[PDB]
Amino acid sequence: GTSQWLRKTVDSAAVILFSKTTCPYCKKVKDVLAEAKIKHATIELDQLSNGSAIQKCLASFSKIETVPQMFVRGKFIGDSQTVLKYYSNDELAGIVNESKYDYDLIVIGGGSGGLAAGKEAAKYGAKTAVLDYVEPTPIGTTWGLGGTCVNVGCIPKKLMHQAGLLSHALEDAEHFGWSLDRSKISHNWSTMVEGVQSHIGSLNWGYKVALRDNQVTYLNAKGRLISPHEVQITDKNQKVSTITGNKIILATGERPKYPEIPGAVEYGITSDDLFSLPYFPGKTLVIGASYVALECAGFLASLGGDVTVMVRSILLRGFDQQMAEKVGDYMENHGVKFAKLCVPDEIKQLKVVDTENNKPGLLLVKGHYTDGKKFEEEFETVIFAVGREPQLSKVLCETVGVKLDKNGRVVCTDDEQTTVSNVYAIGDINAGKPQLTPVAIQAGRYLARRLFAGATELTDYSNVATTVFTPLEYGACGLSEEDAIEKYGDKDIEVYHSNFKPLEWTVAHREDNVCYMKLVCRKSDNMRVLGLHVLGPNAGEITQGYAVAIKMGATKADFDRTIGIHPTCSETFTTLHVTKKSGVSPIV
Amino acid sequence: GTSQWLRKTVDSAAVILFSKTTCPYCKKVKDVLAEAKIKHATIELDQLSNGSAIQKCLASFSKIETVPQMFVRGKFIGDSQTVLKYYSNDELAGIVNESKYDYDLIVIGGGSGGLAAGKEAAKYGAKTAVLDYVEPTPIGTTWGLGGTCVNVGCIPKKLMHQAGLLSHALEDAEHFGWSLDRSKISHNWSTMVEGVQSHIGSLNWGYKVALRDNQVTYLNAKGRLISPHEVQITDKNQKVSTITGNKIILATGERPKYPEIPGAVEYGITSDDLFSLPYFPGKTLVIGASYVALECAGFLASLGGDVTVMVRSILLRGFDQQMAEKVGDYMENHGVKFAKLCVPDEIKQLKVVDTENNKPGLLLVKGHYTDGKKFEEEFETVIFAVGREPQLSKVLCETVGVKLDKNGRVVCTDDEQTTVSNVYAIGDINAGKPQLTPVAIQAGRYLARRLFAGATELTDYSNVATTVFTPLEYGACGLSEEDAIEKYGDKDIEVYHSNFKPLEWTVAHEDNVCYMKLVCRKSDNMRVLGLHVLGPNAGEITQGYAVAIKMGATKADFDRTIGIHPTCSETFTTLHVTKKSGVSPIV
Ligand SMILES: Cc1cc2nc3c(=O)[nH]c(=O)nc-3n(C[C@H](O)[C@H](O)[C@H](O)COP(=O)(O)OP(=O)(O)OC[C@H]3O[C@@H](n4cnc5c(N)ncnc54)[C@H](O)[C@@H]3O)c2cc1C
Ligand SMILES: Cc1cc2nc3c(=O)[nH]c(=O)nc-3n(C[C@H](O)[C@H](O)[C@H](O)COP(=O)(O)OP(=O)(O)OC[C@H]3O[C@@H](n4cnc5c(N)ncnc54)[C@H](O)[C@@H]3O)c2cc1C
Ligand SMILES: COCc1nnc(N)s1
Ligand SMILES: COCc1nnc(N)s1
Ligand SMILES: COCc1nnc(N)s1
Ligand SMILES: COCc1nnc(N)s1
């Protein structure tokens, strides 16, 4: 029924007004609340299909059936006359601030999702605290508010990716008639790092301002859920206390793993350290083969570093393997070396990091290949990118009763709820969800709208598009080719594909047949597009809009009947015709 | 119903075979035709939903109801025994070349649409000729096969744009840590033009190879339609002759206009001349305000030139006017000067063009502003971008009966047919269609499939997306904002909008110049009627969304899709400020 919607809304909301748009009785209660510096949500009943039934159900609480009606934290406050009887008597602040807990909402985690949920909750009148603390890395690195993307993730990595792209810009400029000689131009690592850290510092500051201007309490404190409604916090001075909240959101993210081998923690670094490193890495070994490892190797080479990637098995496990091979081939051709089917055994120190003179150390790496032969080479810097994990034992006492999966992530329902009914989890620690910043933001915002404004919208987690920012970018939306075959059978999968060449590469004398795209389609379902894949420049900008068409169920015919924009790389999707079954070449 | 399809299909097809995939007798006839190099179309009756009706209806032509049946130019040739008999007896080649006309298809015009139409028809066995001739510009400029885009349009204009974009990329490089100093780097015009002309030459060559390998006859001759089936050709040696064809496609495009003022033809140039000009233009006056005018003024500025645009009234007439003003404001902050509400009266010559030393001349331009005040300035080069027109009197005798609208364009039904039943028109001269290269290509290809392979798919001309390649690009798909209010009323229109800033612009040091909006319809589930974005890589951004708009996308379809981070395009997935709210769109 409607009755248990209405009654979840009233129960959970902080301050909420049931109202209508034509009623000037409601319009005067609003203006009172605005000037009184009171935030609230507002269900306009004349714009809901079944506003009539809701008016009746309000009477179960208030014994009346008209509008406006104001509730605070589950209790009916009054109608239009009673609100002004409280206002002019100056009894209104004591009533709107009445609560069994310190906060309506405590977010443990000040990253992508944490800050996004906190700000949206506060819009609708919820008393909100946001906790953030950055445990330092083994060598001591630390940073400010905003989470992993803002400080040591998407933002600093794409900015260094852009710095790497601009070396090809300097090469190309010669052929388009500019008088520079790229031969005599070199890169300065620490000038880059200063500009990058300057931008991050402005996001740190901007988030503190945003929280302040939304009346959100920010505590730079480590938090721990000790009971369903109690969060124990620790100061920067080591002072412990306890705060209480009605709803809890866990949004604490992950940190990089190290392999269990001698020397790794003591002498290597991870991505957490790379984006503010005060010396150029020098001769670098990257261990691992995820998108983090290949993206960092890619711009290290483009800035002129001597870069090696040690690969256990394959590149980009979980991604379309034909495209992953195309990515790796391009990198191998443009400076990155690979040591294939190889694994490390220990890291030995030969020289200590020189802090005063700003120089890396010197390390000796010992490893072995799957056949048996030995790996032994010296590097100045060794970077581990062997995956990320959460440490929920630090965040969450086991007696609270929040269930975790065998990987240590939180098992949630489809509306982010944990096994404890007032506790939710969003972002990287939610089991089974894609680990991406815009996913966490969308989840956090939609959930706050459900707890405090009566919203029903859920987050849709399927067919979320991605881009890997390797020297040649790789964008994808949907199934990889081998997953669609495995799920529907090779006879039911048709794949259209083609090479291409950006117009911008013609005068520049770049390669003819390295850029590549394909559509993986289901025959028996009107050639429905199951996955889209593209290797080339600006692959993120290319892929993104097609994610809407695929969310709507696009078919091959939908692509055929749409006309291209000329000249672009993206238009090549609108005229594809060569099937893989056919055996015809895809070259240009 | 099905009946009238199969009679239209049999009459216009050149060589066509009706068959079934599972039939070894049809396979036997296919294998004979491959070996004899006899190109043909093929209808596979067992993959069509009314193949049974078609099968019975073939008997009205062939007095049989079995497959495989082969036709040539409206005549039943036989079943598998009759065809093999012809093969074995050496009679099959003469039968399949029997024609009342010289060609199954004559295309007049070897540009974007004509080449696409020509190459596609040949795949189905049509005996095809393609005609192309380039009348020179007033100063003598001419070029090779491929049309306006390939030679004096999209392809050279975007390479030159690209040259201009690299100048800001050299600036940005310093801030991201590269040692270069932008201040001591300069641009060589003739080096660029050589690289551009070299790529165009490779396209000229590749199209000639393409026509050769499809057995299309290429005649570098001017063609004129003198009767429904007769095309008069004139040689590069002025030899005149007449060829005949069953179906005629007109695809002759347009050329730039000149204003009727003294000195304009004698001392100015147009875009036709600019992309192969041997000298740098110098101080340039661009007259006009279309996307050609603004794109060219744009890269000439970025390459270091002193550039002025003379605007009669507004910029980008017919495009969303708020977006056009943003496009022009950005150009004005980055070098381009504007002479607003202004029109030219005459061009006077001060220095002739110096061919020996490779230098432009010198000109005095006189004009007036709308209030009467006078304009008088000196420039080395004057570029007219005051529109384009067909000249179908050069193409089409009046007595053939092909009807034209009041602009001289061809009035066509929604299958590209003219008032004469064997004559079709495609591309720029098709009245009322967006004048774009992918549109011409799609129309020429789809039409050839209907004339010669029994296809029925029409070309969809609605909601075709565009990009204007100004220094900051402007992508668009669907109705402008003012157009949508005119059609549905202000109360039924919601506009969501936001400024944004590329991540690449942060370390490189404007905050709120990039902009995008969605124009929606309240009473139709908030249906997206127009998408607009100003920013970098706007074509790459806009294109994919054109599929979702074609499928009828709403605001909720945009909200429920997750973004790709960090990108510019992802800002479309989280828009929330409305124009009626009065809230500011900056970030
Ligand atoms: C190198 C790298 C590059 C990436 N690039 C991209 C990209 O291009 N695009 C993309 O979409 N995603 C990218 N990601 C993934 C993206 O960063 C994550 O999906 C996202 O940051 C997860 O958000 P979150 O809110 O769940 O966690 P986080 O952003 O990690 O925020 C959690 C915060 O809570 C803090 N915290 C932890 N424990 C406690 C505690 N007990 N008390 C208080 N605070 C605590 C953490 O220190 C942190 O500040 C990248 C990740 C990495 C590592
Ligand atoms: C500066 C500029 C930039 C442009 N940029 C873009 C862009 O970025 N994207 C886009 O989509 N569109 C762009 N266009 C438009 C695009 O060029 C046209 O839409 C396209 O060329 C139309 O093709 P068409 O086949 O109709 O004609 P055309 O390509 O003009 O082909 C006509 C051909 O027929 C020849 N011909 C004429 N008369 C005869 C005759 N009697 N006998 C034989 N041959 C004859 C002509 O000389 C020419 O070779 C641009 C146009 C210009 C001028
Ligand atoms: C539990 O760690 C104590 C803390 N140190 N710095 C903070 N900001 S909180
Ligand atoms: C998830 O696998 C982590 C690793 N990758 N490369 C290694 N050598 S260990
Ligand atoms: C009037 O034009 C005669 C020509 N015909 N084809 C050429 N190449 S010159
Ligand atoms: C034929 O000329 C008409 C014009 N169009 N734009 C101008 N500035 S003058």
Residue numbers in the entry:
A (entry chain B): 6 to 593
B (entry chain A): 6 to 514, 516 to 593
What does the publication say?
In this work, we describe the unprecedented screening of a poised library of 768 molecular fragments against SmTGR using X-ray crystallography. Among the 768 fragments used in the crystallography-based screening, a set of 35 fragments were identified as hits. Sites S1–S9 were observed having multiple (> 1) chemotypes bound, while sites S10–S16 bound to a single fragment each.
Schistosomes survival relies on the redox enzyme thioredoxin glutathione reductase (TGR), a validated target for the development of new anti-schistosomal drugs. The S. mansoni TGR (SmTGR) (EC 1.8.1.9) is a homodimeric flavoprotein with a head-to-tail orientation between monomers. Like all mammalian TR, SmTGR is a selenoprotein carrying the amino acid selenocysteine (Sec597). Paired with Cys596, this residue directly participates in enzymatic catalysis together with FAD and at least two other cystine pairs (Cys28-S–S-Cys31 and Cys154-S–S-Cys159) with redox activity.
